[PDB]
Amino acid sequence: CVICDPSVVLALKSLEKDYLPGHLDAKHHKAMMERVENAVKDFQELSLNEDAYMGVVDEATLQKGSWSLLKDLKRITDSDVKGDLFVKELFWMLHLQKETFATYVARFQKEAYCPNKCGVMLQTLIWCKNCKKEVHACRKSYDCGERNVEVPQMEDMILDCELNWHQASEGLTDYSFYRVWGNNTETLVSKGKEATLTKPMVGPEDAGSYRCELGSVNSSPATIINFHVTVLPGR
Ligand SMILES: *[C@@H]1O[C@H](CO)[C@@H](O)[C@H](O)[C@H]1NC(C)=O
């Protein structure tokens, strides 16, 4: 999907206009950029066993492909090779980088494709065929889990509602920390773009059960976590 990157096509324009003249006969100049640009546009068409091929990536993965690719092209041009060898090395490289990029696209589906064990993650994906963006809703468990927090008295209580994938989700509203009781009622204790609720000098009254809802834009919360806090008198 690499050609979906504005910098690759720049490197190609500069490749033809600035590197092709000095090092390639013009009898073969526009006739080669065809083969090349279609070899780049073929990165889209891959496959690797042990999985299918979603035909989709993320910015994080596109940037690796583009980088890893343009680095070696830079190796090529830096060498100043210019014969009927230039056209050999260029495409050997063009094969190998297809391999490497294929590995990248594998790691992406295996690990970074909807990596939430719970909640709703809005993940920006790029369709490789048409180089176009869509926001994909990754849906899993409603409530992520339950945290058991034990804290000694006079220590600081720290409730964390942040997960490894919140920094990568989108359309996120604030974190809200509510307080639940027997009253059946609950009072919002905190609300902001801080993923943690810290209450200093915890007491027997601070113990109980809290809840954290990470809001999303025009939707249900991305994450809900229930904290069960209990207090010890040690120290
Ligand atoms: C729940 O308890 C708190 C403190 O005990 C109190 O402020 C609140 O009014 C209670 N809710 C009821 C009684 O509905």
From Swiss-Prot:
Extracellular side: 1-233
UniProt key word NAD: no
GO CC entries: acrosomal membrane; acrosomal vesicle; endoplasmic reticulum membrane; membrane; plasma membrane; protein complex involved in cell-cell adhesion
Residues carrying a glycan: N183
UniProt tissue specificity: Sperm-specific (at protein level). Detectable on sperm surface only after the acrosome reaction.
Highest rank taxon of the organism: Eukaryota
Residue ranges of the region described as Important for interaction with IZUMO1R: 127-139
Name of the protein described by the UniProt record: Izumo sperm-egg fusion protein 1
Native organism taxonomy: Eukaryota, Metazoa, Chordata, Craniata, Vertebrata
